[PDB]
């Protein structure tokens, strides 16, 4: 398990599309990841936390991988994140 403290960049307030691409990303992993963002943690492929994270530049959201491809799944989830713009 490892985690990522992200700091994000969006402003427009964190916008669900993107993080649904983070759903289906999450989804195909043996890993998984949970979302820590302030009181919301969540299943990062589930909707039920992700679709109402109110990440907005100053939010820092940390992800913790556990799975057998842990560490893999953060090198494409860091990627992607940046893609989608929870990161910089």
């Known amino acids: 398990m490892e985690q990522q403290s ?3 960049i969006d ?4 916008h669900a599309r993107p993080a649904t691409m983070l ?3 999450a989804s195909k992993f ?4 949970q979302l820590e963002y302030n009181g919301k943690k969540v299943n990062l492929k589930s909707i039920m936390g992700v679709m109402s994270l109110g ?5 820092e959201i940390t992800i913790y991988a556990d799975g057998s491809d ?3 799944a953060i090198q494409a ?4 994140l940046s893609k989608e713009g929870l990161t910089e």
């Not at 043996?30 to 990841?33: E, K, P, T, V």
């Open 30 to 33: 043996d890993s998984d990841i």
């Open 6 to 8: 992200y700091t994000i």
């Open 11 to 14: 402003e427009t307030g964190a």
């Open 77 to 80: 989830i860091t990627d992607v």
């Open 55 to 59: 990440v907005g530049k100053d939010a």
């Open 23 to 25: 759903v289906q990303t």
């Open 70 to 72: 842990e560490a893999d």
